[PDB]
Paper text:
Amine transaminases (ATAs, EC 2.6.1.x) are enzymes with great potential in biocatalysis for the enantioselective synthesis of chiral primary amines from pro-chiral ketones. One of the main factors limiting the implementation of transaminases on an industrial scale for the synthesis of chiral amines is their poor storage and operational stability. In the present paper we have described and validated a possible inactivation model for the well-characterized homodimeric (S)-selective amine transaminase from Chromobacterium violaceum. Computational and experimental studies show that the stabilization role of PLP is exerted primarily at the level of the catalytic lysine K288 and secondarily at the level of the PGBC.
The cryo-protection of single holo-Cv-ATA protein crystals in the presence of the amino donor 1-(S)-phenylethylamine (20 mM) led to the conversion of PLP to PMP in cristallo without producing any visible crystal cracking (Supplementary). The final refined structure model (Supplementary) contains two homodimers per asymmetric unit, reciprocally oriented according to the same weak translational pseudo-symmetry described for the holo-form of the enzyme and each showing the same overall backbone folding. The clear discontinuity in the electron density between the cofactor ring and the K288 side chain (Supplementary) justified the modeling of the cofactor moiety as PMP in all chains with 100% occupancy. In agreement with what has been observed for other PLP-dependent enzymes, the conversion of PLP to PMP is associated with a small combined tilt and twist reorientation of the cofactor ring hinged on its pyridine nitrogen (Supplementary). The side chain of K288 was modeled with 100% occupancy in the forward conformation with only the three most terminal side chain atoms tilted away from the amino group of PMP (Supplementary). The PMP·Cv-ATA structure shows that, upon breakage of the K288-PLP Schiff base linkage, neither K288 nor the other variability regions rearrange to their apo-conformation on the seconds time scale of cryoprotection. Since the actual reaction turnover is expected to be orders of magnitude faster, it can be concluded that these structural rearrangements do not occur during the catalytic cycle and must be the outcome of a different process. The newly solved PMP·Cv-ATA crystal complex confirmed that none of the known conformational rearrangements occur on the second time scale of crystal cryoprotection and, by extension, during the much faster time scale of catalytic turnover. Recently Börner et al. reported that Cv-ATA incubation in the presence of an amine substrate results in enzyme de-stabilization and explained this observation with the possible diffusion of the non-covalently bound PMP away from the active site. This is in agreement with our model, as the conversion of PLP to PMP releases the K288 from the Schiff base constraint and enables the K288 reorientation to the backward conformation.
Residue numbers in the entry:
A (entry chain B), B (entry chain A): 6 to 458
């Protein structure tokens, strides 16, 4: 029963990013089944999954073909390691397919179990690369305040969430942070395009404050996900790239979210028009059907790692055959069923138009934004004056609770509301989701006013 | 073909703990199928897997029931996150079953994708614990030289492999290391039991040097795996535990290898008779059939973490439903099919007797050792003098290459040779494996002499 599952969960399970005592007193929501864009819970609610699991179930729920690929691989060879001068066909075939869907010059992939492990891999690869170049001082990686790069000690350090830094005595050494390109807060009297150049040049100013000979890499999500779908101006990434090339700093895209079609390009960096030296992946790589991540290593960094002999790094389940077989089915479906192309040409433009049509009218909604199948808005105290609520996050929590009670999953990141539904969502699904979201915002506005805004 | 698979692997795949240029020149061995204790490669060789994948395929290859459990869960609900005050039946049922097979006082489990992530989780938990206790200086974790705790930045820093420290600028702060309890090298004129007390007192020396008020935890593998199946004396772990309790230091077992039956007990700390405050797991948790790890949190540390409110840590695939369903089937089989009990009562004692009967006679083999279904020996230049070969690892590589050419997988850790076969191996299989190993060592002794070493 719901009761028994909640009691066992409270007794035995510690959840990610959770206040355990609060969750155990409230009761966990038990999700039992998924099909297309929908979920069911243990109380029989049918739920619109406007978050695709956690930005990751890109082909939607219910792929029986993926379950068959897993079953077949698991019966033949459930596991073999890639440590003993050994490989297996599933990881070879996935590596070959991944070279076809990635840009030219990304031939070589290193596998992990998660986006967090891909980020730690990338940190060790970047530092190893500069050692092989004979630059042992070039070790600092620069991230952003409100960037998210996972939950390993490495990834939490590179990320810019102070609430994670405060648990574990982070960041570790050789990590620095610049402000995020959040125009609504930091744009002063500028247009987004003017601001994009200013926000990019924060990187150059930080490189010069530290010393360029000490800086290994700049790492960024093309769009900041957990930070609230912070979509940088069009001028931002070309300027970041120019600054990285000027100082001989590696450029790293964290594609764990934007990867595998979320923007309508295969990768977020293709949408924003920059060319990273390496990029990190997970999530959409297998649509979340099994845990797998990757680091895609460009030609320059690959040659440096190869010139360095032993790379003393990796995970038991790196290249796991069952995970590789499911990822292969998933990437083959994204390409061969035209799912990525449909985001670029059809459902992305429709979602973006309908999202702006739906939210733009609300008194306490501003900065309506998105690309492809990631979109967001911010809850604001005064739209005219672009004033935010104090205690950023309290009002976002009120709004997300209304969504959840109405069987719609959209997440609050502070007072940002975000959505990243399965890429296969139909136009009709998009309209159904926006109709429920619109009713939830009307209730939100009524509640604000009733309670004294 | 073998040729086509090797060419694609060389072009596209970066392997864990590998010299890529050397592997791509040699050609990777392509493993295609597994059954019981055996593997087949792309050239049709049948191979005895004396390493159970990578110390992890505890129930052996060919569990069609596990593939069915994976298929069924993947069709129903392939993924849902445990972040949104959400849970799902598979992770609840696994959490309940794990409380039944773990010692009393380990009710609460935190899920990861890997042993490395479990170690990073444990480091952030132990630091968070001491913050909640109001001891914010108590942050240093102590490990051992030649200890292995994974390949995240955190796990590589806590581990004691200098060849990992040198790639990534590790260890991170708040990490210290003591010498390993390796009697053959460090025991001088002591008995093993005398040496166990001296080697444990190295921990006391390190605590007093740092200051107990700055030390959060001591972390150790019950038996050092990747370091070469370093089996400590019987006096070691009781003395470690006495020292940790004296100085108010948490005691952490890394059970990633010893866990899930490898010693004949469910966990290595039960064999060696110490009670850790937390322990890390992966590998045998799912017999490697899908990626999953865990941190088992004892009552005292669990209460501290719960009293701390939000724990700002976790992974997208934490508690992954498909991985949890397979882990559940695996743990149920270990208990209900009597597999762990059989290691303790039957196959463990048989292996340990036959291992000692097989190797003890060879002129350049010494320190023949093991417990349950993990066993090892050291290749030595002169047994009388306990003189090791120079360039520790070169002679182990020669010996491992003979095994691999004879379709037997045993791993070299420097000049240690180690074995950890599936726990379901039959007595007959054990004799088959030992007969091949014996012939390989005869060849090894002939090759040593032929080459003047
Ligand atoms: C941009 C980014 N990078 C890294 C990670 C970490 O991935 P994982 O949770 O699979 O460890 C995430 C997870 N949301 C992410 O969004
Ligand atoms: C004791 C120990 N701890 C942690 C790890 C890391 O586990 P993983 O490779 O699954 O990240 C290993 C891996 N062999 C290990 O042997």
């Amino acid at each position: 029963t719901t009761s028994q599952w909640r009691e066992l969960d409270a007794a035995h399970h510690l959840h990610p990013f959770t206040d355990t005592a609060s969750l155990n007193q409230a009761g966990a929501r038990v999700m039992t089944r998924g099909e297309g864009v929908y979920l069911w819970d243990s109380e029989g609610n049918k739920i619109i999954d406007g978050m695709a699991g956690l930005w990751c179930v890109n082909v939607g729920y219910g792929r029986k073909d993926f379950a068959e690929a897993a079953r077949r691989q698991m019966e033949e060879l459930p596991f073999y390691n890639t440590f003993f001068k050994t490989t297996h066909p599933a990881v070879v075939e996935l590596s070959s397919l991944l070279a076809e869907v990635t840009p030219a010059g990304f031939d070589r992939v290193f596998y992990t179990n998660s986006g967090s492990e891909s980020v730690d891999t990338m940190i060790r690869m970047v530092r190893r690369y500069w050692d092989v170049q004979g630059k042992p001082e070039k070790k600092t990686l620069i991230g952003r305040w409100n960037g998210y790069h996972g939950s390993t000690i490495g990834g939490a350090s590179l990320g810019g969430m102070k609430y994670m830094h405060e648990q574990g005595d982070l960041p570790i050494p050789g990590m620095a942070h610049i402000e995020q390109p959040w125009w609504y807060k930091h744009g002063k009297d500028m247009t987004p395009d003017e601001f994009g150049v200013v926000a990019a040049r924060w990187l150059e100013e930080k490189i010069l404050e530290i010393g360029a000979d000490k800086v290994a890499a700049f790492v960024g999500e093309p769009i900041q996900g957990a930070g609230g779908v912070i979509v940088p101006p069009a001028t931002y990434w070309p300027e970041i790239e120019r600054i990285c090339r000027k100082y001989d700093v590696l450029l790293v895209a964290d594609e764990v979210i934007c990867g595998f079609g979320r923007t309508g390009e295969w990768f977020g960096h293709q949408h924003f028009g920059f060319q990273p030296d390496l990029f990190t992946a997970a999530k959409g790589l297998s649509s979340g059907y099994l845990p797998i991540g990757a680091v895609f290593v460009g030609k320059r960094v690959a040659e440096g790692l190869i010139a360095g002999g032993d790379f003393n790094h990796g995970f038991t389940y790196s290249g796991h055959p069952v995970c590789a077989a499911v990822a292969h089915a998933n990437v083959a479906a994204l390409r061969d069923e035209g799912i990525v192309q449909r985001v670029k040409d059809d459902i992305g433009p429709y979602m973006q138009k309908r999202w702006r049509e739906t939210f733009s009218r609300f008194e306490h909604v501003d900065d309506v934004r998105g690309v492809g199948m990631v979109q967001a808005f911010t809850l604001v105290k005064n739209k005219a004056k672009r004033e935010l609520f104090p205690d950023f996050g309290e009002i976002g929590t009120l709004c997300r609770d209304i969504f959840f009670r109405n069987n719609l999953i959209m997440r609050a990141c502070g007072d940002h509301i975000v959505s990243a539904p399965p890429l296969v969502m139909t136009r009709a699904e998009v309209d159904e989701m926006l109709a429920v979201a619109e009713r939830c915002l009307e209730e939100f506005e009524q509640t604000l006013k009733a309670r004294g805004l």
